[PDB]
Structure formats: structure tokens, C-alpha cells
Amino acid sequence: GSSGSSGLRKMVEEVFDVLYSEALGRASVVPLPYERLLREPGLLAVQGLPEGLAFRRPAEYDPKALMAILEHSHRIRFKLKRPSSGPSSG
């Protein structure tokens, strides 16, 4: 089918998901239930975020933010309550 088509938020919409799934060590890319993760920060803490921002939906974020997220993404790193996070490769 289809899924997104060039979008600042749509670009990060997957990032957070990927990163999350990466830390989760899953096979498929799962979504990021902010409404939840937000409630409990201890459950999953977001690190390596784009300075001058706050962990929140990719939409809620600002315009330049998303751009700073996709740019700072290289830093963006998820942290699960459980130790030993699945590294990308490096």
C-alpha cells in the first residue's frame, strides 16, 4: 500500500518508532505510545534529544524542531527501564 510521503514529522514519526523498536529489540517497527511513555518517564527515557526541546509527539513538536530532531537524531537515543539496550551496530 502506501505510507507517508515526505514529511518533517513523518520523518521523525518513524525515527522514534525505529529507535524505540531498536531498544525494544523487536523485529517489526512498533509505534511510540507517547500518551503512555509520557505518563511514565521511568518506563522509557528519551536521551540524546535536540537541545532546546522536550520529549513529545513528533507532531506536537515545532517545525524547526523536527528538522533538529532528524538532524540531532544521530544523538537521539532511547532508554528502557531495563538495562542493556540493543545497539544499532557501532
PDB file of all heavy atoms in Angstrom, residues 40-73:
ATOM      1  N   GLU A  40       4.662   7.643  32.186  1.00  0.00           N
ATOM      2  CA  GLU A  40       5.757   7.059  32.942  1.00  0.00           C
ATOM      3  C   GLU A  40       7.079   7.255  32.198  1.00  0.00           C
ATOM      4  O   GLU A  40       7.361   6.551  31.229  1.00  0.00           O
ATOM      5  CB  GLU A  40       5.500   5.577  33.222  1.00  0.00           C
ATOM      6  CG  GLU A  40       4.576   4.970  32.166  1.00  0.00           C
ATOM      7  CD  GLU A  40       4.267   3.506  32.481  1.00  0.00           C
ATOM      8  OE1 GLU A  40       5.110   2.884  33.164  1.00  0.00           O
ATOM      9  OE2 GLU A  40       3.196   3.041  32.034  1.00  0.00           O
ATOM     10  N   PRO A  41       7.877   8.240  32.693  1.00  0.00           N
ATOM     11  CA  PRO A  41       9.162   8.537  32.085  1.00  0.00           C
ATOM     12  C   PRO A  41      10.198   7.471  32.445  1.00  0.00           C
ATOM     13  O   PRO A  41      11.137   7.233  31.688  1.00  0.00           O
ATOM     14  CB  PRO A  41       9.530   9.919  32.600  1.00  0.00           C
ATOM     15  CG  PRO A  41       8.669  10.149  33.832  1.00  0.00           C
ATOM     16  CD  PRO A  41       7.574   9.093  33.838  1.00  0.00           C
ATOM     17  N   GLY A  42       9.992   6.857  33.601  1.00  0.00           N
ATOM     18  CA  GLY A  42      10.896   5.821  34.070  1.00  0.00           C
ATOM     19  C   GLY A  42      10.799   4.570  33.195  1.00  0.00           C
ATOM     20  O   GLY A  42      11.761   3.813  33.078  1.00  0.00           O
ATOM     21  N   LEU A  43       9.628   4.392  32.601  1.00  0.00           N
ATOM     22  CA  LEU A  43       9.393   3.246  31.739  1.00  0.00           C
ATOM     23  C   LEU A  43      10.317   3.331  30.522  1.00  0.00           C
ATOM     24  O   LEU A  43      10.892   2.326  30.105  1.00  0.00           O
ATOM     25  CB  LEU A  43       7.910   3.143  31.379  1.00  0.00           C
ATOM     26  CG  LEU A  43       7.450   1.798  30.814  1.00  0.00           C
ATOM     27  CD1 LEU A  43       7.290   0.761  31.928  1.00  0.00           C
ATOM     28  CD2 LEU A  43       6.167   1.957  29.993  1.00  0.00           C
ATOM     29  N   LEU A  44      10.432   4.537  29.989  1.00  0.00           N
ATOM     30  CA  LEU A  44      11.277   4.764  28.828  1.00  0.00           C
ATOM     31  C   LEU A  44      11.693   6.236  28.788  1.00  0.00           C
ATOM     32  O   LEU A  44      10.860   7.116  28.579  1.00  0.00           O
ATOM     33  CB  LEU A  44      10.576   4.288  27.554  1.00  0.00           C
ATOM     34  CG  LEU A  44      11.141   4.825  26.238  1.00  0.00           C
ATOM     35  CD1 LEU A  44      12.671   4.764  26.231  1.00  0.00           C
ATOM     36  CD2 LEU A  44      10.533   4.093  25.041  1.00  0.00           C
ATOM     37  N   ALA A  45      12.985   6.458  28.990  1.00  0.00           N
ATOM     38  CA  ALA A  45      13.522   7.808  28.979  1.00  0.00           C
ATOM     39  C   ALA A  45      14.178   8.079  27.624  1.00  0.00           C
ATOM     40  O   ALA A  45      14.912   7.239  27.107  1.00  0.00           O
ATOM     41  CB  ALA A  45      14.500   7.978  30.145  1.00  0.00           C
ATOM     42  N   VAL A  46      13.891   9.257  27.088  1.00  0.00           N
ATOM     43  CA  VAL A  46      14.444   9.651  25.804  1.00  0.00           C
ATOM     44  C   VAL A  46      15.680  10.521  26.030  1.00  0.00           C
ATOM     45  O   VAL A  46      15.598  11.569  26.668  1.00  0.00           O
ATOM     46  CB  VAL A  46      13.369  10.343  24.962  1.00  0.00           C
ATOM     47  CG1 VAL A  46      13.889  10.652  23.556  1.00  0.00           C
ATOM     48  CG2 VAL A  46      12.092   9.505  24.903  1.00  0.00           C
ATOM     49  N   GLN A  47      16.799  10.053  25.495  1.00  0.00           N
ATOM     50  CA  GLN A  47      18.052  10.777  25.632  1.00  0.00           C
ATOM     51  C   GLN A  47      18.604  11.147  24.253  1.00  0.00           C
ATOM     52  O   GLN A  47      18.139  10.635  23.237  1.00  0.00           O
ATOM     53  CB  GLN A  47      19.072   9.962  26.430  1.00  0.00           C
ATOM     54  CG  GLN A  47      18.687   9.900  27.908  1.00  0.00           C
ATOM     55  CD  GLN A  47      19.188  11.136  28.658  1.00  0.00           C
ATOM     56  OE1 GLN A  47      20.373  11.419  28.720  1.00  0.00           O
ATOM     57  NE2 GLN A  47      18.222  11.856  29.222  1.00  0.00           N
ATOM     58  N   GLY A  48      19.588  12.034  24.263  1.00  0.00           N
ATOM     59  CA  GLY A  48      20.208  12.478  23.027  1.00  0.00           C
ATOM     60  C   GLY A  48      19.223  13.282  22.178  1.00  0.00           C
ATOM     61  O   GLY A  48      19.309  13.281  20.950  1.00  0.00           O
ATOM     62  N   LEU A  49      18.307  13.950  22.864  1.00  0.00           N
ATOM     63  CA  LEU A  49      17.305  14.757  22.187  1.00  0.00           C
ATOM     64  C   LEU A  49      17.950  16.056  21.698  1.00  0.00           C
ATOM     65  O   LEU A  49      19.049  16.406  22.122  1.00  0.00           O
ATOM     66  CB  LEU A  49      16.094  14.976  23.094  1.00  0.00           C
ATOM     67  CG  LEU A  49      14.977  13.934  22.985  1.00  0.00           C
ATOM     68  CD1 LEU A  49      14.121  13.914  24.252  1.00  0.00           C
ATOM     69  CD2 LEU A  49      14.136  14.160  21.727  1.00  0.00           C
ATOM     70  N   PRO A  50      17.217  16.752  20.788  1.00  0.00           N
ATOM     71  CA  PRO A  50      17.705  18.005  20.237  1.00  0.00           C
ATOM     72  C   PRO A  50      17.581  19.140  21.255  1.00  0.00           C
ATOM     73  O   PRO A  50      16.476  19.591  21.555  1.00  0.00           O
ATOM     74  CB  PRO A  50      16.870  18.236  18.987  1.00  0.00           C
ATOM     75  CG  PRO A  50      15.642  17.354  19.137  1.00  0.00           C
ATOM     76  CD  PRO A  50      15.910  16.368  20.263  1.00  0.00           C
ATOM     77  N   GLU A  51      18.729  19.567  21.760  1.00  0.00           N
ATOM     78  CA  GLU A  51      18.762  20.639  22.740  1.00  0.00           C
ATOM     79  C   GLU A  51      17.664  21.662  22.444  1.00  0.00           C
ATOM     80  O   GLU A  51      17.371  21.946  21.284  1.00  0.00           O
ATOM     81  CB  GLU A  51      20.138  21.306  22.775  1.00  0.00           C
ATOM     82  CG  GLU A  51      21.201  20.344  23.306  1.00  0.00           C
ATOM     83  CD  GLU A  51      22.505  21.081  23.616  1.00  0.00           C
ATOM     84  OE1 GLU A  51      22.451  22.329  23.672  1.00  0.00           O
ATOM     85  OE2 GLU A  51      23.526  20.382  23.788  1.00  0.00           O
ATOM     86  N   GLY A  52      17.087  22.189  23.515  1.00  0.00           N
ATOM     87  CA  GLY A  52      16.027  23.174  23.385  1.00  0.00           C
ATOM     88  C   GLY A  52      14.741  22.531  22.867  1.00  0.00           C
ATOM     89  O   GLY A  52      14.181  22.972  21.863  1.00  0.00           O
ATOM     90  N   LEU A  53      14.307  21.497  23.573  1.00  0.00           N
ATOM     91  CA  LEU A  53      13.096  20.788  23.196  1.00  0.00           C
ATOM     92  C   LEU A  53      12.600  19.968  24.389  1.00  0.00           C
ATOM     93  O   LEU A  53      13.093  20.124  25.505  1.00  0.00           O
ATOM     94  CB  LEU A  53      13.333  19.957  21.933  1.00  0.00           C
ATOM     95  CG  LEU A  53      12.950  20.623  20.610  1.00  0.00           C
ATOM     96  CD1 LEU A  53      13.030  19.629  19.452  1.00  0.00           C
ATOM     97  CD2 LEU A  53      11.572  21.282  20.706  1.00  0.00           C
ATOM     98  N   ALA A  54      11.629  19.108  24.112  1.00  0.00           N
ATOM     99  CA  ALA A  54      11.060  18.263  25.147  1.00  0.00           C
ATOM    100  C   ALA A  54      10.470  17.005  24.506  1.00  0.00           C
ATOM    101  O   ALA A  54       9.868  17.074  23.435  1.00  0.00           O
ATOM    102  CB  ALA A  54      10.020  19.056  25.941  1.00  0.00           C
ATOM    103  N   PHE A  55      10.663  15.885  25.187  1.00  0.00           N
ATOM    104  CA  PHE A  55      10.158  14.615  24.697  1.00  0.00           C
ATOM    105  C   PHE A  55       8.639  14.662  24.518  1.00  0.00           C
ATOM    106  O   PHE A  55       7.895  14.695  25.496  1.00  0.00           O
ATOM    107  CB  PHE A  55      10.503  13.560  25.751  1.00  0.00           C
ATOM    108  CG  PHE A  55       9.804  12.216  25.538  1.00  0.00           C
ATOM    109  CD1 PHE A  55       9.835  11.619  24.316  1.00  0.00           C
ATOM    110  CD2 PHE A  55       9.150  11.619  26.570  1.00  0.00           C
ATOM    111  CE1 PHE A  55       9.186  10.371  24.118  1.00  0.00           C
ATOM    112  CE2 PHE A  55       8.501  10.371  26.373  1.00  0.00           C
ATOM    113  CZ  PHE A  55       8.533   9.774  25.151  1.00  0.00           C
ATOM    114  N   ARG A  56       8.225  14.661  23.259  1.00  0.00           N
ATOM    115  CA  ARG A  56       6.807  14.703  22.938  1.00  0.00           C
ATOM    116  C   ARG A  56       6.581  14.289  21.483  1.00  0.00           C
ATOM    117  O   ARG A  56       7.521  14.251  20.690  1.00  0.00           O
ATOM    118  CB  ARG A  56       6.235  16.105  23.158  1.00  0.00           C
ATOM    119  CG  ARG A  56       7.281  17.179  22.854  1.00  0.00           C
ATOM    120  CD  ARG A  56       6.647  18.379  22.149  1.00  0.00           C
ATOM    121  NE  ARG A  56       5.770  19.113  23.089  1.00  0.00           N
ATOM    122  CZ  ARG A  56       6.197  20.062  23.932  1.00  0.00           C
ATOM    123  NH1 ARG A  56       7.496  20.397  23.959  1.00  0.00           N
ATOM    124  NH2 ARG A  56       5.331  20.674  24.749  1.00  0.00           N
ATOM    125  N   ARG A  57       5.327  13.987  21.176  1.00  0.00           N
ATOM    126  CA  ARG A  57       4.965  13.576  19.830  1.00  0.00           C
ATOM    127  C   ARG A  57       5.760  14.378  18.798  1.00  0.00           C
ATOM    128  O   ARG A  57       6.216  15.484  19.083  1.00  0.00           O
ATOM    129  CB  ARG A  57       3.470  13.775  19.577  1.00  0.00           C
ATOM    130  CG  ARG A  57       2.743  12.432  19.498  1.00  0.00           C
ATOM    131  CD  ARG A  57       1.239  12.607  19.713  1.00  0.00           C
ATOM    132  NE  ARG A  57       0.668  11.385  20.323  1.00  0.00           N
ATOM    133  CZ  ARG A  57      -0.644  11.168  20.484  1.00  0.00           C
ATOM    134  NH1 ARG A  57      -1.530  12.089  20.082  1.00  0.00           N
ATOM    135  NH2 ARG A  57      -1.072  10.028  21.046  1.00  0.00           N
ATOM    136  N   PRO A  58       5.908  13.772  17.589  1.00  0.00           N
ATOM    137  CA  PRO A  58       6.641  14.418  16.513  1.00  0.00           C
ATOM    138  C   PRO A  58       5.816  15.545  15.888  1.00  0.00           C
ATOM    139  O   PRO A  58       6.369  16.451  15.264  1.00  0.00           O
ATOM    140  CB  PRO A  58       6.963  13.303  15.533  1.00  0.00           C
ATOM    141  CG  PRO A  58       6.006  12.170  15.860  1.00  0.00           C
ATOM    142  CD  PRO A  58       5.383  12.462  17.216  1.00  0.00           C
ATOM    143  N   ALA A  59       4.508  15.452  16.075  1.00  0.00           N
ATOM    144  CA  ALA A  59       3.601  16.452  15.537  1.00  0.00           C
ATOM    145  C   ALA A  59       3.572  17.662  16.471  1.00  0.00           C
ATOM    146  O   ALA A  59       3.767  18.796  16.032  1.00  0.00           O
ATOM    147  CB  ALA A  59       2.217  15.834  15.339  1.00  0.00           C
ATOM    148  N   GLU A  60       3.326  17.383  17.743  1.00  0.00           N
ATOM    149  CA  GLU A  60       3.268  18.435  18.743  1.00  0.00           C
ATOM    150  C   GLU A  60       4.498  19.338  18.636  1.00  0.00           C
ATOM    151  O   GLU A  60       4.396  20.553  18.797  1.00  0.00           O
ATOM    152  CB  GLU A  60       3.140  17.848  20.149  1.00  0.00           C
ATOM    153  CG  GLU A  60       1.734  17.293  20.387  1.00  0.00           C
ATOM    154  CD  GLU A  60       0.970  18.149  21.400  1.00  0.00           C
ATOM    155  OE1 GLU A  60       1.281  18.015  22.604  1.00  0.00           O
ATOM    156  OE2 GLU A  60       0.093  18.915  20.948  1.00  0.00           O
ATOM    157  N   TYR A  61       5.632  18.710  18.364  1.00  0.00           N
ATOM    158  CA  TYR A  61       6.880  19.440  18.234  1.00  0.00           C
ATOM    159  C   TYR A  61       6.729  20.615  17.265  1.00  0.00           C
ATOM    160  O   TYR A  61       5.704  20.746  16.597  1.00  0.00           O
ATOM    161  CB  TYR A  61       7.893  18.448  17.660  1.00  0.00           C
ATOM    162  CG  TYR A  61       8.864  17.879  18.697  1.00  0.00           C
ATOM    163  CD1 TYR A  61       9.123  16.524  18.730  1.00  0.00           C
ATOM    164  CD2 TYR A  61       9.481  18.722  19.600  1.00  0.00           C
ATOM    165  CE1 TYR A  61      10.037  15.990  19.705  1.00  0.00           C
ATOM    166  CE2 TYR A  61      10.394  18.186  20.576  1.00  0.00           C
ATOM    167  CZ  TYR A  61      10.627  16.848  20.581  1.00  0.00           C
ATOM    168  OH  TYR A  61      11.491  16.342  21.502  1.00  0.00           O
ATOM    169  N   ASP A  62       7.766  21.438  17.217  1.00  0.00           N
ATOM    170  CA  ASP A  62       7.761  22.598  16.340  1.00  0.00           C
ATOM    171  C   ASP A  62       8.254  22.182  14.952  1.00  0.00           C
ATOM    172  O   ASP A  62       8.548  21.011  14.718  1.00  0.00           O
ATOM    173  CB  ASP A  62       8.695  23.689  16.866  1.00  0.00           C
ATOM    174  CG  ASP A  62       9.188  23.483  18.299  1.00  0.00           C
ATOM    175  OD1 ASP A  62       8.323  23.468  19.201  1.00  0.00           O
ATOM    176  OD2 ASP A  62      10.419  23.345  18.460  1.00  0.00           O
ATOM    177  N   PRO A  63       8.330  23.193  14.044  1.00  0.00           N
ATOM    178  CA  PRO A  63       8.782  22.944  12.685  1.00  0.00           C
ATOM    179  C   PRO A  63      10.297  22.743  12.640  1.00  0.00           C
ATOM    180  O   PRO A  63      10.777  21.717  12.160  1.00  0.00           O
ATOM    181  CB  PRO A  63       8.320  24.155  11.890  1.00  0.00           C
ATOM    182  CG  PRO A  63       8.037  25.243  12.913  1.00  0.00           C
ATOM    183  CD  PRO A  63       7.989  24.590  14.286  1.00  0.00           C
ATOM    184  N   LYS A  64      11.011  23.739  13.146  1.00  0.00           N
ATOM    185  CA  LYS A  64      12.462  23.684  13.169  1.00  0.00           C
ATOM    186  C   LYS A  64      12.910  22.542  14.084  1.00  0.00           C
ATOM    187  O   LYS A  64      14.027  22.041  13.956  1.00  0.00           O
ATOM    188  CB  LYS A  64      13.043  25.046  13.555  1.00  0.00           C
ATOM    189  CG  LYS A  64      13.150  25.962  12.335  1.00  0.00           C
ATOM    190  CD  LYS A  64      11.869  26.779  12.149  1.00  0.00           C
ATOM    191  CE  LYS A  64      11.906  27.566  10.838  1.00  0.00           C
ATOM    192  NZ  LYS A  64      10.744  28.479  10.749  1.00  0.00           N
ATOM    193  N   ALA A  65      12.017  22.165  14.987  1.00  0.00           N
ATOM    194  CA  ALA A  65      12.307  21.092  15.922  1.00  0.00           C
ATOM    195  C   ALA A  65      12.514  19.788  15.149  1.00  0.00           C
ATOM    196  O   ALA A  65      13.594  19.200  15.194  1.00  0.00           O
ATOM    197  CB  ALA A  65      11.176  20.988  16.948  1.00  0.00           C
ATOM    198  N   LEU A  66      11.462  19.374  14.456  1.00  0.00           N
ATOM    199  CA  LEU A  66      11.516  18.151  13.674  1.00  0.00           C
ATOM    200  C   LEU A  66      12.825  18.114  12.883  1.00  0.00           C
ATOM    201  O   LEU A  66      13.500  17.086  12.842  1.00  0.00           O
ATOM    202  CB  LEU A  66      10.266  18.018  12.802  1.00  0.00           C
ATOM    203  CG  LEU A  66       8.927  18.025  13.543  1.00  0.00           C
ATOM    204  CD1 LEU A  66       7.757  18.091  12.559  1.00  0.00           C
ATOM    205  CD2 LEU A  66       8.816  16.826  14.486  1.00  0.00           C
ATOM    206  N   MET A  67      13.146  19.247  12.277  1.00  0.00           N
ATOM    207  CA  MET A  67      14.362  19.356  11.490  1.00  0.00           C
ATOM    208  C   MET A  67      15.602  19.172  12.366  1.00  0.00           C
ATOM    209  O   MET A  67      16.619  18.650  11.909  1.00  0.00           O
ATOM    210  CB  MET A  67      14.413  20.730  10.817  1.00  0.00           C
ATOM    211  CG  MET A  67      13.649  20.721   9.491  1.00  0.00           C
ATOM    212  SD  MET A  67      13.545  22.377   8.834  1.00  0.00           S
ATOM    213  CE  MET A  67      11.968  22.876   9.503  1.00  0.00           C
ATOM    214  N   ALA A  68      15.476  19.607  13.612  1.00  0.00           N
ATOM    215  CA  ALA A  68      16.575  19.494  14.557  1.00  0.00           C
ATOM    216  C   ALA A  68      16.596  18.080  15.141  1.00  0.00           C
ATOM    217  O   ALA A  68      17.617  17.638  15.666  1.00  0.00           O
ATOM    218  CB  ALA A  68      16.429  20.569  15.637  1.00  0.00           C
ATOM    219  N   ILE A  69      15.459  17.409  15.029  1.00  0.00           N
ATOM    220  CA  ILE A  69      15.335  16.055  15.540  1.00  0.00           C
ATOM    221  C   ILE A  69      15.943  15.079  14.533  1.00  0.00           C
ATOM    222  O   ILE A  69      16.672  14.163  14.913  1.00  0.00           O
ATOM    223  CB  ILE A  69      13.879  15.747  15.893  1.00  0.00           C
ATOM    224  CG1 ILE A  69      13.374  16.677  16.998  1.00  0.00           C
ATOM    225  CG2 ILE A  69      13.705  14.272  16.262  1.00  0.00           C
ATOM    226  CD1 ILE A  69      11.879  16.960  16.836  1.00  0.00           C
ATOM    227  N   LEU A  70      15.623  15.305  13.268  1.00  0.00           N
ATOM    228  CA  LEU A  70      16.128  14.457  12.203  1.00  0.00           C
ATOM    229  C   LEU A  70      17.626  14.707  12.025  1.00  0.00           C
ATOM    230  O   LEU A  70      18.344  13.857  11.498  1.00  0.00           O
ATOM    231  CB  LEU A  70      15.315  14.659  10.923  1.00  0.00           C
ATOM    232  CG  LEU A  70      13.794  14.645  11.085  1.00  0.00           C
ATOM    233  CD1 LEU A  70      13.126  15.580  10.077  1.00  0.00           C
ATOM    234  CD2 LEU A  70      13.247  13.219  10.996  1.00  0.00           C
ATOM    235  N   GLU A  71      18.056  15.878  12.472  1.00  0.00           N
ATOM    236  CA  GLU A  71      19.457  16.251  12.370  1.00  0.00           C
ATOM    237  C   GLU A  71      20.218  15.804  13.619  1.00  0.00           C
ATOM    238  O   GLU A  71      21.349  15.330  13.524  1.00  0.00           O
ATOM    239  CB  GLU A  71      19.608  17.757  12.145  1.00  0.00           C
ATOM    240  CG  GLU A  71      19.345  18.123  10.683  1.00  0.00           C
ATOM    241  CD  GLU A  71      19.810  19.548  10.383  1.00  0.00           C
ATOM    242  OE1 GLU A  71      20.961  19.861  10.756  1.00  0.00           O
ATOM    243  OE2 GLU A  71      19.004  20.295   9.786  1.00  0.00           O
ATOM    244  N   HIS A  72      19.567  15.971  14.762  1.00  0.00           N
ATOM    245  CA  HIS A  72      20.170  15.589  16.028  1.00  0.00           C
ATOM    246  C   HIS A  72      19.887  14.113  16.307  1.00  0.00           C
ATOM    247  O   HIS A  72      20.454  13.532  17.233  1.00  0.00           O
ATOM    248  CB  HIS A  72      19.692  16.509  17.154  1.00  0.00           C
ATOM    249  CG  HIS A  72      20.090  17.954  16.979  1.00  0.00           C
ATOM    250  ND1 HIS A  72      20.403  18.781  18.044  1.00  0.00           N
ATOM    251  CD2 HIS A  72      20.223  18.711  15.852  1.00  0.00           C
ATOM    252  CE1 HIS A  72      20.709  19.979  17.568  1.00  0.00           C
ATOM    253  NE2 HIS A  72      20.595  19.934  16.209  1.00  0.00           N
ATOM    254  N   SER A  73      19.010  13.546  15.491  1.00  0.00           N
ATOM    255  CA  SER A  73      18.646  12.147  15.639  1.00  0.00           C
ATOM    256  C   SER A  73      19.890  11.311  15.940  1.00  0.00           C
ATOM    257  O   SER A  73      19.877  10.475  16.843  1.00  0.00           O
ATOM    258  CB  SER A  73      17.946  11.625  14.382  1.00  0.00           C
ATOM    259  OG  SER A  73      18.836  10.893  13.541  1.00  0.00           O
TER     260      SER A  73
END
